[PDB]
């Protein structure tokens, strides 16, 4: 929030892309037994602010869909990227970039991640998984 | 911005997002993208609430999008709803109409905006335009 | 021509029930320079799963290897689709020749439009100009 406020007033989002994906369905789902999921996110930022005034926020995801009552029905590992640039006056530091990625970066990318999960699970013929809407402090 | 923020700030503390949905959409591509592109996005907030009977409310944001060549290529008119729950302290009075509208203009908007962004990006890509990534909400 | 003939007895009694993605693996390895031409190579291979003594239905799987380059890979994908067919039969079971024949002909042909839409969707998500696979 504060650590990244300075970069937040000067940074503009440019584009979003999928970097990579890998997924497979292993077994039939069993809603009636109880179907569940685990979703691990890992954020990262790529920058080199002395050479270019552009950075990339990446979120790596690991999705595990499982039959309860705990057997795996499908798994996916994918990663999205968001491209930003800024107009400077002092270069952004690693802390500033990290805080911005953790807040604006993460919440910009989350809807793309949710849409992808919904699309993928549909394509694998699983019950469509719609992730929860994540709260953000205003 | 900051004065509406002030007025909807007790709501920011008591309320949490539950879900979003697209309520309606209309879009057509008119003319080919040539030169560079540009866009215009106008929004109007509204809120549906009945605090005497239910401690949840719906924020609605209506949007008019125009995409153009820098010198109309495509237009879209759509409306999103975000459903919120709130939880008062014992004895706290109900949100008023002014807190509700203020919140819908500020935090409601802020919560929805990244979903609007993903929708616009998806829609423009489908219409076979250069995918549009909406600018950061300042 | 040939396999159309071998497959025709099964083709006249079989109906497609559903299509699904089984697996996918894809990456953008080097961002394409904007608007410089992209070329593609798609390799496919049909396979069929069947046990006519147990079940009068079979699954055609098409596995796909997609390489995209500039006109050194820009992007790659490896994925597999499945089509589930049901059939109705004193007629004999279909033989492994009728099944393989159907799979490399009617099976491939029913799957190919869905392979096209997936490649389009996936290339678009990778921020490439969306690719539209050629007519089969």
């Amino acid at each position: 929030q504060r650590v990244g406020a300075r970069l937040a007033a000067r940074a503009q989002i440019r584009d979003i892309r999928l970097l990579r994906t890998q997924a497979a369905v292993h077994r039939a789902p069993k809603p009636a037994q109880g179907l569940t999921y685990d979703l691990e996110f890992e954020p990262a930022v790529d920058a080199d602010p002395a050479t270019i005034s552009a950075f990339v926020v990446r979120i790596s995801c690991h999705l595990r869909i499982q039959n309860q009552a705990t057997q795996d029905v499908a798994t996916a590992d994918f990663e999205f990227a968001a491209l930003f640039d800024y107009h400077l006056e002092d270069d952004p530091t690693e802390e500033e970039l990290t805080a911005y990625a953790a807040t604006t970066g993460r919440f910009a990318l989350y809807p793309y991640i949710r849409e992808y999960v919904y699309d993928l699970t549909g394509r694998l013929a699983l019950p469509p998984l719609t992730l929860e809407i994540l709260s953000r402090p205003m | 911005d900051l004065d509406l923020q002030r007025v909807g700030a007790r709501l920011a503390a008591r309320a949490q997002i539950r879900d979003i949905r697209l309520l309606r959409t209309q879009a057509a591509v008119h003319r080919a993208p040539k030169q560079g592109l540009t866009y215009d996005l106008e929004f109007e907030p509204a809120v549906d609430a009945d605090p005497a009977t239910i401690s949840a409310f719906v924020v609605r944001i209506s949007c008019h999008l125009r995409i153009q060549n820098q010198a109309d290529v495509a237009t879209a008119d759509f409306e999103f709803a975000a459903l919120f729950d709130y939880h008062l302290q014992e004895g706290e009075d109900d949100p008023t109409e002014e807190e509700l509208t203020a919140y819908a203009a500020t935090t409601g908007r802020f919560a929805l905006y990244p979903y609007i962004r993903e929708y616009v990006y998806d829609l423009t890509g489908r219409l076979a335009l250069p995918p549009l990534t909406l600018e950061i909400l300042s | 021509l040939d396999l159309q003939r071998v497959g025709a007895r099964l083709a006249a009694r079989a109906q497609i029930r559903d299509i699904r993605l089984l697996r996918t693996q894809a990456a953008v390895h080097r961002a394409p320079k904007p608007a410089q031409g992209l070329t593609y190579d798609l390799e496919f291979e049909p396979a069929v799963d069947a046990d006519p003594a147990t079940i009068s239905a079979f699954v055609v799987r098409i596995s796909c290897h997609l390489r995209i380059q500039n006109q050194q890979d820009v992007a790659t994908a490896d994925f597999e689709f499945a089509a589930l067919f049901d059939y109705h039969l004193g007629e004999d079971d279909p033989t492994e020749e009728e099944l393989t024949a159907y799979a490399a002909t009617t099976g491939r042909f029913a799957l190919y439009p869905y392979i096209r839409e997936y490649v389009y969707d996936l290339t678009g998500r990778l921020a490439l100009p969306p690719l539209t696979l050629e007519i089969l």
Binding site: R17, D46, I52, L83 | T38 | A31
Partner: peptide, 12 residues
């Protein structure tokens, strides 16, 4: 190198 990517067109 930062792994940026670029479109022909842009909306800026």
């Amino acid at each position: 190198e930062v792994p940026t990517w670029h479109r022909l067109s842009s909306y800026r």
